[PDB]
Amino acid sequence: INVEIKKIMKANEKVTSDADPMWYLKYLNIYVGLPDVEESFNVTRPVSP
Amino acid sequence: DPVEIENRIIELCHQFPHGITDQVIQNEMPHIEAQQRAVAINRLLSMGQLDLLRSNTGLLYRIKDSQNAGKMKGSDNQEKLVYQIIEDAGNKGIWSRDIRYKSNLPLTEINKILKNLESKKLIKAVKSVAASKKKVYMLYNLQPDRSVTGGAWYSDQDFESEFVEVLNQQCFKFLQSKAETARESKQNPMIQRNSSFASSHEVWKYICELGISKVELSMEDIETILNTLIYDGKVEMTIIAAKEGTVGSVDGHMKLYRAVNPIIPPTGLVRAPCGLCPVFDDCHEGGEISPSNCIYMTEWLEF
Amino acid sequence: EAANEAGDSSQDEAEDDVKQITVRFSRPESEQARQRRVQSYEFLQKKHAEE
Ligand code: SF4
């Protein structure tokens, strides 16, 4: 989660389509954050195991 | 100066749109060596303004098609890089899907190119009658081929079954009348056969004099109609040897058609409901489909 | 072998094999195909021969 995920994101950082050139989607940095639960209405909250 | 040599070659190509040969180039500029001329031609072909053609007289160097412009919006690069295969197809035409796959360009880009060319009158879109899926694009100057589009039978991508049936009926009536006249003449067997024989050109002129439809019907079209009649089992065709005459269609050969009666009348199998039954395979003594409680034979006996 | 196939007959008539204009499109090559062409052995051999 600290190094390998970043390396994979760097390997697949850029993705583009053949049609309509000059269009691309570039990934800069990926985060995992802390464990949260999607129970609340569009609100995050720390949840225990 | 190689730049001056290239400029002079381009000027000569402009003067001769059909192309120029090494002999013409040498006659125009004799003080330059063949090696320098070849280097100049190689540079021109590498930069992409000249095209090479191999004719019975040798090699021709023609200026690339750039003055004829139908899509000036954007860049002439894609314009010519589409017009190339547009012209290559020409009479046979090419579908939009094939144009896209050959150009490796987006659908929107190719559609814009085609629309601009059609607005500036360089290409025409015609519906493919063989497969009515997309409209093929052809050159506005070339005549549309009959196989890929058009045809004396097809009218607006619709086959004229009634028209072909009328043609067949009229041809069969004419051949039957001719055979009847030949039989009534009863002058000699060979003369009777020769008179019952009908020539392709003769039946074509007869159909033209009739004038059932407005579209011009060709001798080959009438020949195809007569071949369909033969396949129908009503006329017979014979190839005789005649050097030249009023037909002059085939070299040394002439096709003569005559209406002939069938070999034998309808057989006995067709006279029974069992021979014309579509579920004949499922026939069985004891079951749902049984000859005892059959409906086909019941109605056939009631009639 | 090509010359033999051509001279299979004693007298070869003038063949009407005029080279039709088969100018293919310089299609825009995708990045992957361009990298493949660059890494191909023929491209490297031609680059070495250019010198
Ligand atoms: S239903 Fe009667 S007529 Fe039809 S196939 Fe069977 S036996 Fe023959």
Swiss-Prot record, chain A:
Q: Which domain of life is it from?
A: Eukaryota
Location within or outside the cell: Nucleus; Cytoplasm, Cytosol
Cystine residue pairs: none
Query: What family name appears in the similarity comment?
Result: Belongs to the RNA polymerase beta chain family.
Function statement: Catalytic core component of RNA polymerase III (Pol III), a DNA-dependent RNA polymerase which synthesizes small non-coding RNAs using the four ribonucleoside triphosphates as substrates. Synthesizes 5S rRNA, snRNAs, tRNAs and miRNAs from at least 500 distinct genomic loci. Pol III-mediated transcription cycle proceeds through transcription initiation, transcription elongation and transcription termination stages. During transcription initiation, Pol III is recruited to DNA promoters type I, II or III with the help of general transcription factors and other specific initiation factors.
What does the subunit comment say? Component of the RNA polymerase III (Pol III) complex consisting of 17 subunits: a ten-subunit catalytic core composed of POLR3A/RPC1, POLR3B/RPC2, POLR1C/RPAC1, POLR1D/RPAC2, POLR3K/RPC10, POLR2E/RPABC1, POLR2F/RPABC2, POLR2H/RPABC3, POLR2K/RPABC4 and POLR2L/RPABC5; a mobile stalk composed of two subunits POLR3H/RPC8 and CRCP/RPC9, protruding from the core and functioning primarily in transcription initiation; and additional subunits homologous to general transcription factors of the RNA polymerase II machinery, POLR3C/RPC3-POLR3F/RPC6-POLR3G/RPC7 heterotrimer required for transcription initiation and POLR3D/RPC4-POLR3E/RPC5 heterodimer involved in both transcription initiation and termination.
Q: What is this protein called?
A: DNA-directed RNA polymerase III subunit RPC2
Q: Which organism is it from?
A: Homo sapiens (Human)
Q: Report where the shown chain sits in the full-length sequence: first residue, last residue, total length.
A: 51 to 99 of 1133
Curated annotation (Swiss-Prot), chain B:
Claim: Methyltransferase is one of the keywords in the record: no
Asked if the keyword Acetylation belongs to this entry, the reply reads yes
Q: Which UniProt keywords apply?
A: Acetylation, Antiviral defense, DNA-binding, DNA-directed RNA polymerase, Immunity, Innate immunity, Isopeptide bond, Nucleus, Transcription, Ubl conjugation
InterPro entries for this protein: RNA_pol_Rpc34 (IPR007832), RNA_pol_Rpc34-like (IPR016049), WH-like_DNA-bd_sf (IPR036388), WH_DNA-bd_sf (IPR036390)
List this protein's GO terms for biological process.
Answer: defense response to virus; innate immune response; positive regulation of innate immune response; positive regulation of interferon-beta production; regulation of transcription by RNA polymerase III; transcription by RNA polymerase III
User: What cellular-component terms does GO give this entry?
Assistant: cytosol; nucleoplasm; RNA polymerase III complex
Q: Where in the cell is it found?
A: Nucleus
Could you tell me one molecular function GO term of this UniProt entry? Answer: DNA-directed RNA polymerase activity
One Pfam match: RNA_pol_Rpc34
The entry's [4Fe-4S] cluster-binding residues are C274, C277, C283, C294
Q: What does this protein do?
A: DNA-dependent RNA polymerase catalyzes the transcription of DNA into RNA using the four ribonucleoside triphosphates as substrates. Specific peripheric component of RNA polymerase III (Pol III) which synthesizes small non-coding RNAs including 5S rRNA, snRNAs, tRNAs and miRNAs from at least 500 distinct genomic loci. Part of POLR3C/RPC3-POLR3F/RPC6-POLR3G/RPC7 heterotrimer that coordinates the dynamics of Pol III stalk and clamp modules during the transition from apo to elongation state.
Q: What illness does the record link it to? A: Immunodeficiency 101, varicella zoster virus-specific: An autosomal dominant immunologic disorder characterized by reactivation of varicella zoster virus (VZV) infection in adulthood after primary childhood infection with VZV. The viral reactivation manifests as central nervous system vasculitis with stroke-like episodes and lacunar infarcts on brain imaging. Features include headache, hemiparesis, impaired balance, and other neurologic signs.
UniProt lists the family membership as follows: Belongs to the eukaryotic RPC34/RPC39 RNA polymerase subunit family.
Whose protein is this, by species?
A: Homo sapiens (Human)
Swiss-Prot record, chain C:
Please give the name of this protein: DNA-directed RNA polymerase III subunit RPC5
Note the subunit structure.
Component of the RNA polymerase III complex consisting of at least 17 subunits: a ten-subunit horseshoe-shaped catalytic core composed of POLR3A/RPC1, POLR3B/RPC2, POLR1C/RPAC1, POLR1D/RPAC2, POLR3K/RPC10, POLR2E/RPABC1, POLR2F/RPABC2, POLR2H/RPABC3, POLR2K/RPABC4 and POLR2L/RPABC5; the stalk composed of two subunits POLR3H/RPC8 and CRCP/RPC9, forming a structural mobile part that protrudes out of the core and functions primarily in transcription initiation; and additional subunits homologous to general transcription factors of the RNA polymerase II machinery, POLR3D/RPC4-POLR3E/RPC5 heterodimer and POLR3/CRPC3-POLR3F/RPC6-POLR3G/RPC7 heterotrimer.
**Crosslink feature (Glycyl lysine isopeptide (Lys-Gly) (interchain with G-Cter in SUMO2)) location:** K19
Q: Which cysteines form disulfides?
A: none
Give the residues annotated as coiled coil: none
Q: Which residues carry this modification: Phosphoserine?
A: S9, S10, S40
Q: Which domain of life is it from?
A: Eukaryota
Which organism's genome codes for this protein? Homo sapiens
Q: Where in the cell is it found?
A: Nucleus
State what this protein does. DNA-dependent RNA polymerase catalyzes the transcription of DNA into RNA using the four ribonucleoside triphosphates as substrates. Specific peripheric component of RNA polymerase III (Pol III) which synthesizes small non-coding RNAs including 5S rRNA, snRNAs, tRNAs and miRNAs from at least 500 distinct genomic loci. Assembles with POLR3D/RPC4 forming a subcomplex that binds the Pol III core. Enables recruitment of Pol III at transcription initiation site and drives transcription initiation from both type 2 and type 3 DNA promoters.
Q: What is the primary gene name for this protein?
A: POLR3E
Where do the record's region annotations for Disordered lie?
A: 1-18
